[PDB]
Design a protein around this ligand. Structure first.
Ligand code: MG
Ligand code: MG
Ligand code: MG
Ligand code: MG
Ligand code: MG
Ligand code: MG
Ligand code: MG
Ligand code: MG
Ligand code: MG
Ligand code: MG
Ligand code: MG
Ligand code: MG
Ligand code: MG
Lengths: 349, 349, 349, 349, 349
């Protein structure tokens, strides 16, 4: 509900945060070299500026992108094009890669699937690589870049050795890796839903299926173009070093394909999943139909026979018929049996 | 209904307005430069002519395109090809871009979705960029170019600084932006329809679904080729300046993709939406089936038992059977219970 | 039925008319220049021959192509390849364009949809452009080229000025224009069928849908490759003048795309149209189910109660129970009400 | 059933016939020139060898390809690659074209649809064109190359004039032509099945549909890649003469497209054909539902009324009510009528 | 269940076995030349090292890839890139081909379908070709490379003559051949399932269909990209000899296409297979509906007639009507007959 993407009647240079989360704000900077390590959390937009010309690869984090003054001030000092800055403040946008002679701009989307409930939230994560610096813009607190920090903080891996271009890889690779966790959560919900559809189905089950299907399509709407997002990098990378950045992006490019294939795999399953429900229900009804019919067929005629001898008349042959009462109960028994014999037959005649 | 696109048995140079709205007519001209601003509304076709050679970027609006004399007179003075003029008067046509050495011709479509009713009207908007002049042809009064006027009128943005080629961007960008508003209106109708399908469904609901689906397909029929319309510009723009016009068209080209993706996203949802209805109805019927059966199964046999003792005979063992009347009422109670015990079982047997 | 396309066990040079209409035969020739106009109807195959070297653009019509002797004699004198002549006499063939150094061969298909009945007939129209001459081969009398004749006969348009290559455009454009008329006829049938499916559905409705769907697919089978047919011309035209023929073919090429899009638009509608019928029927059945159940549930138990006091016994407490007859009628009233109160509930439980 | 394609755990040079027909064996050779004609049937593999260097175009037929000794001996003397020979003995393989400097290898599939039964048999036909010689390998006796023989035997057509490369055309064209006969047989079965689905449907009808659909898909599995098979030839033909072989292959290449389009046309029809059956059945059930309900609604209440006066009591107001017996029969008549008046209403309420 | 692919928060150089089988470990080496043959089974990682520079083509087998120490030690000595080694230990990955100047890395997947149960296990098989050496990494004991060993062990075929590059072919060809065996197993299950759906359907049948469909999609998820896997080799092979390796890969490349076509063929069948079940069930219900209705229609009115004469009144015309009891039994007979005459009619009215 709500969250309407409009920004209508506005010039392209307009800077407006269209997101849900304008609650909190934070800036974090992690500068590093093979020798040293440093990091701090400030709300000052001025302190992060002189790091632009820093030779050492610097990782800049900006949370609470709702602050337009910060975005503009940062973009102006880095010479970032207004439209690029505008795309950042627009939380409703398809992930992409826009190459520039000065920098590289990339839009990405984080995801979080709720437990004991069916909902998929999405926080847009934009990043910019220029010189030795890498920006990162988010909405709320929390990310998947925590182990990236640790590997830098604890000097764990080659991430300390190589530059910010390889850091860019690590940041992307960390996010792409998170999608696998998301898929497994969704894959569980499918298996749970599959069971509910196959056996013991009930009300609201159809609703859950529609929820899953709709959420699954929206998921592909993000992941599917994300393939081209990484496909663009793998075959271009003009400022990035070919000797290092290229073969690593390849593995990430391999991941997003497997992820996209995994998503499309689910859509095919969920699509035919609803028909499975419909097939089961009709089968249940068909079973119930058999039950109702074999009853009404072995009583209604026998009920009618009782109604015959139930109706009073001036002339009744039963008084002249010895042992009529038992044989009437007996002849109905034969009728009851032969119908059952007539039943257990070959249906679909 | 009606609005049949025929114009059969006519030479290609024929100028005929095939639209619904021939009611009113208006011409508006907005000339501007970084120094000054001017605009007026006249019905004279002669007054707008000398603006052709105006160095300042001039925005020409022509409403009520039903007037063929105006279209021809304008096209002749601008040296516009007859077929191009013919395409304008044809309101039933797929949006496109036809490049020429003198000018650039673009067909576009406005939309308006009705509230408390399901209908999608479409007004074709054609425009031509030549020299420093930009034409715009419409059917009826009203447009999405009002903020474009204001930004020029109030000197708000870079639109005053740059030329008509950037104005072309602003005009297109203003229209493309309107589609987002249209989608949100439709997205609401889906959510409303989804609820009606999922819970408390009734008559005419299916009709609304068919209305939405049909209107949604027609929507894609316009938006889908509009992608190529802007894709053509982004990779060509021969007369337009590359230093400015190109990177701005890119953002618009990014918008139409997201819009087209948003539309196709809906089609997948609406497609399986009808099966959700069918799945629910069969489930309801299956529920009703269970109700009817468990009733007829616990009465018809007991009804038959009553018919037995209801039928009169010469020999009745009930008179020789002490307390037969209560035990008959009692033995039927056991039958009633064990069936319910037989019920609440595992269905789909 | 019938109309089997076989011609099996035959050499490629075989000339056999495989069409339904061998009834009548006619040859018409319309030669013209910017100065003069001439036309006549003869059955002589010799009189049309010397027009081959005529400098003036000549339009040759040959109706009743069943005459193999005429086709061969014409093809031989024009140096037309046997296979091309063979393709002409084959009425069952997909429309195409085969370029040659001497001429250009094009297969096209006319259509006529019947009113008050569902059927689509198709007459193959082949044409050949060589030098200043343009051939046209048909099956039966009647065509859409009547206004083409009039525009030439009355000197109406530029068709008199330009050559046979532009006449080729006019001939094609006249035929492509006819498809719009066909679509509108079909579009009406859809709207009529949609109404019948949405409201007041009955028997044979499904048959009409299957008829429409099947006829619609066959329609696309012709129109869809016809796109490439005109796409081939627009990007090649080796003998045709680029200064004139090319930009006009473009408009026709734009038409066939809109037509093909219009057809595919219908297929998507007709596809889900059948499910709408199925959805409505099940809803009707579900409604009928509710009616039947709420009846059997408020009578069968009350019927059983009557059967209790209907059954005769030696001991009846009713004689010792004052006002039993009214209170039995009263207690059943409560049962009848509470079930209705139990009804009007939330279904799909 | 059976016919399992395995040949597992075998080197690529293994020569094993995997077909069903190893019953009979035959070799036929038809050598010809514009002057003379000769043919004979021998079982000798040695007699066919010296024809390799024959200047005259020679047509070699080998039936009963189960004989591995013949295949190897022929392949060795012609210098044919082992894998090519292996592909021949493999009857389960997708049709293709493998170009070589010495020869051209083509896999093709014959078909035969049974009457009064639903089954599609397929015999793989492989052929090799080298020098002036053309090989042809089959499984069983019988083919579509009989008129090809006759046209050569009777010197009927240009097939006698041109070389084996044109003979290759004739052989292929003869086979491609056979598919049209196959389609017409299948097209009849569809029309017959359509009628059975539309009107008077019964048991086993669904089975026939599943048989047709499955057989239709397998048909496309052969014809669809056969398009590329001929598409490969039309755009390559390195050893074949361009002045003759190319334009003739074009017509065949046009045929296979029309055939493939005809097949895909059927799949779309057969797909929605099953839903037509389902739509009809539900409509029948809905009709039966109406019948059952309008009965139970006009009797069960009236039956209950009879049960009221059927139940015996100490106090009966009927004895004090004059003409009660007729008016009870009368008041039930009103109830019976008003329900029918209540019926014939607007359903789907 | 389980087998979650995560490895989150880890540097790219991390070596972790993500497979199910860490149970057993084995290394086997088969070195060979046209003169000699040798093989042995050791657990020593050092003994396999000096074979790297061996001129003779050497086949190295490593089972139980869970041992990370072996993988790293082998990769380091061969100069294998860490990411390549990482991909090996990742059992959840899409098959691919990554070319390098030193070697060629290929991921492949073995399969085993269970009998009397529906499940598809998959063991990833990775291999590396460098110099004259070919590595092969597996999870558990058992493979399809047994006949490959035998053909080498018994000097059976050309596999002994040619080098490891041709051995690479044999290894791949042996695996690709196994898929045919897998398909035949699945094809049987389809035919068995088809029968169960067409005739004598029951509970759990739908579940089996959903199992087959889901397993079939996952099967394509592996085989479909495997086409491009071999398509990459066939058109590149930089270190492999063109004179031998290329034409053999072609046959394998032809196999994987036929396999992929065979899989997609099944998906189309299985898709419409569920609707066949739904169509049959509704037909059964429709049959049961007819049975129930024709009963309730020929008794309920006759039951009501009995209730009339069953109801007691002060005035009964039956005593004044001679032979009323028989004629009541007679008039009901007429009603019973005419309804049956009314039945056996044209349904779907
Ligand atoms: Mg904007
Ligand atoms: Mg990897
Ligand atoms: Mg026109
Ligand atoms: Mg933007
Ligand atoms: Mg022919
Ligand atoms: Mg036009
Ligand atoms: Mg082999
Ligand atoms: Mg032909
Ligand atoms: Mg990693
Ligand atoms: Mg092979
Ligand atoms: Mg369906
Ligand atoms: Mg009674
Ligand atoms: Mg009684």
């Amino acid at each position: 509900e709500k969250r309407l993407s409009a920004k209508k009647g506005l010039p392209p240079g307009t800077l407006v945060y269209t997101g849900k989360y304008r609650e909190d704000f934070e800036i974090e900077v992690m500068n590093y070299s093979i020798e040293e390590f440093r990091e701090f959390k400030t709300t000052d937009v001025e302190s992060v500026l002189p790091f632009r010309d820093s030779s050492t690869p610097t990782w800049i984090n900006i949370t609470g992108i709702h602050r337009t003054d910060v975005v503009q001030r940062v973009g102006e000092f880095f010479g970032i094009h207004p439209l690029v800055l505008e795309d950042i403040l627009n939380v409703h946008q398809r992930p992409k890669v826009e190459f520039f002679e000065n920098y590289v701009f990339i839009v990405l989307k984080m995801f979080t699937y709720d437990k004991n409930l069916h909902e998929l939230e999405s926080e847009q994560v934009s990043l910019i690589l220029t010189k030795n610096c890498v920006l990162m813009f988010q909405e709320k607190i929390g990310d998947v870049f925590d182990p990236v920090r640790e590997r830098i903080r604890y000097n764990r891996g080659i991430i300390r050795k190589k530059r910010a271009d390889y850091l860019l890889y690590s940041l992307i690779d960390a996010l792409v890796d998170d999608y696998f966790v998301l898929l497994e959560k969704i894959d569980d919900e499918i298996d749970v839903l599959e069971e509910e559809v196959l056996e013991r189905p009930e009300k609201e089950t159809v609703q859950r299926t529609h929820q899953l299907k709709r959420n699954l399509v929206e998921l592909r709407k993000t992941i599917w173009p994300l393939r081209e997002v990484l496909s663009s990098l793998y075959r271009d990378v003009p400022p990035l070093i070919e000797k290092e950045t290229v073969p690593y992006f390849r593995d990430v490019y391999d991941h997003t394909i497997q992820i996209a294939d995994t998503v499309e795999t689910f859509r095919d399953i969920v699509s035919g999943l609803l028909d499975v429900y419909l097939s089961s229900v009709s089968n249940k009804t068909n079973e119930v139909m058999k039950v109702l019919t074999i009853i009404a067929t072995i009583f209604m005629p026998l009920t009618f026979i009782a109604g015959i001898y139930g109706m009073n008349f001036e002339y009744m042959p039963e008084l002249r018929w010895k042992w009529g009462y038992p044989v009437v109960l007996a002849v109905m028994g034969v009728i009851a049996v032969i119908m059952v014999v007539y039943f257990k037959k070959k249906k679909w005649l």
